[PDB]
Design a protein around this ligand. Structure first.
Ligand SMILES: *[C@@H]1[C@H](O)[C@@H](O)[C@H](O[C@H]2O[C@H](CO)[C@@H](O)[C@H](O)[C@H]2NC(C)=O)[C@@H](C(=O)O)[C@H]1O
Length: 435
């Protein structure tokens, strides 16, 4: 219980049907440069394989990023070898995840892309390979040196066509996604119109940071009107072209994250909330960007030093433990003095109702009167840290994540209740499960 909480109502409507969350919704995004060491994405990397399994029995590993500008496949600047691709196959087998694989359109040749694609299709195979992507954020190639100032959608469409044609010559069944950029009208909308028969889905990026002492934990917990616009833009592309969308690179802040924001418990609330907000908008899935010890990485570490779950991971863990199923109406009322509380109701594939709550209010505890659920018993797992800016001390279900993504709940809490009352501290999260 909490001292002076904001008393809010949550009404679940099992008749207000939303989108069905696919089982491969979860995912991660990594740099292609990781493939320069064949021990990274390897059957031997049992620690990293463990972290991914805990995030989902199904999910998508996306490899790409700015380093796909300067990674170069060779059958014998970073170099990708057949051994790296062979090892990646074994990693996907250990995790059960599917692959989005970046090809080098920024600096590589169409012929080298077709050769790399052929080797990936030879070894990873059609079942595990979801899509190739032809360049990462082509709209920023100029910013990053890789094309001249005059490079525009028309030029990129020419490149894309040349690469597509060369690859399909070597790999007739090759699947593609694109354009692998932030939402925008000059690139993503015309990409969808022009290449709708040649791609499986639209690939777009999102950073809560816009174009700075102004990305703060306070700002990160607030609604992002730009995100709502971009998501609406993607749904209109889907209506116009039939192409579903996946958020294939996202994190709290770009340029590697912001110390004191991206590496904090607040990122767990942000990331868990984002996963549900995009799933409710009809996104097919998500891929949080990371690697190394970057401020925003979900999993930190290396094969030689070992891996650990960073705060953001715990947001993704809450989503993982909720599991898949159909989103339901979950209306909040009396909530104007706790406006950053979000709630998502889910009919699980196993038939049980779940509710994911993110109390993103930094200074208000809440007391949630839950109606519209008929159950003899509800339990809560809490997503907690002692302060919103904590870089550690994060737990879920009263336990940290251990080595190799090991996680089990250690604290059982019943929700008192044809209604239920749930207290939540300021800056906390909760997963409710009803028998
Ligand atoms: C998405 C890009 O694809 C991604 O590569 C960016 O991250 C990398 O590059 C930026 C800019 O140089 C670095 O600051 C990051 O540390 C890099 N991340 C990793 C994991 O190596 C990414 C971003 O800006 O953070 C997006 O632009």
């Amino acid at each position: 219980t909490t001292s002076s909480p904001v008393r809010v109502g949550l009404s679940v409507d099992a008749s207000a049907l939303g989108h069905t969350i696919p089982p491969d919704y979860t995912g991660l995004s990594y740099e292609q440069a990781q493939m320069a060491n064949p021990n990274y994405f390897s059957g031997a990397n049992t620690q990293l394989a463990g972290f991914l399994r805990t995030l989902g029995r199904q999910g998508v590993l996306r490899i790409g990023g700015n380093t796909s500008e300067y990674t170069f496949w060779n059958r014998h600047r970073e170099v990708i070898t057949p051994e790296a691709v062979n090892n990646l196959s074994e990693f996907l087998d250990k995790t059960g995840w599917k692959l989005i694989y970046g090809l080098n359109l920024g600096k590589g040749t169409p012929e080298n892309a077709a050769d790399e694609a052929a080797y990936v299709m030879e070894t990873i195979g059609a079942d595990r390979l979801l899509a190739f992507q032809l360049g990462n954020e082509p709209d920023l190639f100029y910013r990053n040196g890789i094309r001249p100032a005059s490079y525009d959608f028309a030029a990129y469409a020419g490149d894309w066509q040349r690469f597509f044609t060369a690859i399909r010559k070597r790999v007739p069944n090759a699947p593609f996604a694109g354009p692998d950029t932030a939402y925008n009208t000059k690139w993503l909308v015309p990409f969808a119109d022009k290449f709708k028969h040649d791609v499986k889905f639209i690939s777009s990026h999102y950073y809560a940071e816009g174009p700075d002492p102004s990305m703060t934990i306070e700002r990160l917990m607030k609604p992002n009107p730009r995100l709502l616009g971009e998501t609406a833009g993607l749904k209109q592309v889907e209506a116009d072209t039939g192409l579903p969308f996946r958020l294939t690179e996202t994190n709290s802040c770009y340029q590697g994250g912001k110390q004191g924001v991206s590496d904090t418990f607040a990122a767990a609330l942000w990331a868990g909330d984002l996963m549900y907000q995009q799933a409710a908008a009809g996104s097919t899935g998500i891929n949080f960007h990371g690697g190394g010890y970057g401020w925003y990485t979900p999993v930190a570490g290396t094969p030689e030093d070992g891996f650990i779950a960073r705060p953001e991971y715990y947001g993704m863990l809450l989503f993982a433990q909720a599991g898949a199923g159909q989103l339901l109406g979950a209306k909040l009322t009396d909530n104007s003095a706790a406006p950053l509380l979000t709630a998502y109701a889910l009919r699980g594939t196993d038939g049980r109702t779940r509710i994911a709550l993110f109390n993103k209010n930094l200074d208000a505890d809440v007391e949630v009167a839950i109606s519209g659920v008929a159950s003899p018993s509800g339990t809560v797992l809490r997503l907690e840290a002692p302060r919103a800016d904590d870089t550690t001390d994060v737990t879920f279900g009263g336990a940290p994540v251990g080595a190799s993504g090991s996680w089990s709940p250690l604290v059982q809490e019943y929700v008192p209740g044809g209604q239920f009352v749930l207290h939540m501290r300021k800056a906390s999260g909760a997963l409710l499960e009803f028998a």
